[PDB]
Structures are given as C-alpha cells and as structure tokens.
Amino acid sequence: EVMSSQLDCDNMAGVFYMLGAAMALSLITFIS
C-alpha cells in the first residue's frame, strides 16, 4: 500500500478548500 499521492483532480479536496476559505476571508476583507 505504498505509492505516491496526487489527491486526484476532482471534487473539493484539501488546499483548494483553504484557498476558498481565504477567498471568502478576502471577500470579507475587500468589502470592509
């Protein structure tokens, strides 16, 4: 069960969710 991780290329995975939360925070920081 040893291989390489690519996290696929579909759905809402990690990092991108953090970038989305950062995008929402930026949306709350630009509208202020």
Partner 1 sequence: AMWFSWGVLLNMVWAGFAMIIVASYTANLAAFLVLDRPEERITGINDPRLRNPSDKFIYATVKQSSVDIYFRRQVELSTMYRHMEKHNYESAAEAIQAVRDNKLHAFIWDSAVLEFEASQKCDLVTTGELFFRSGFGIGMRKDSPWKQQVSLSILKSHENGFMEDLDKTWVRYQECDSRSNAPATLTCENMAGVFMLVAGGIVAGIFLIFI
- Output the smallest distance, CB 10 to partner 1, in A: 18
Which residues contribute to the site for partner 1 (CB under 8 A)? 1-5, 14-15, 18-19, 21-22, 25
Q: How far is the CB of 32 from partner 1 (least distance, A)?
A: 16
User: In Å, how far are 4, 17, 20, 22, 29 from 11, measured between CA atoms?
Assistant: 19, 10, 13, 18, 27
> How far apart are CB 26 and partner 1 at their closest, in Å?
8
Sign of the alpha-carbon torsion through 21, 23, 28, 32: positive
Question: Which of 10/14 has CB closer to partner 1?
Answer: 14
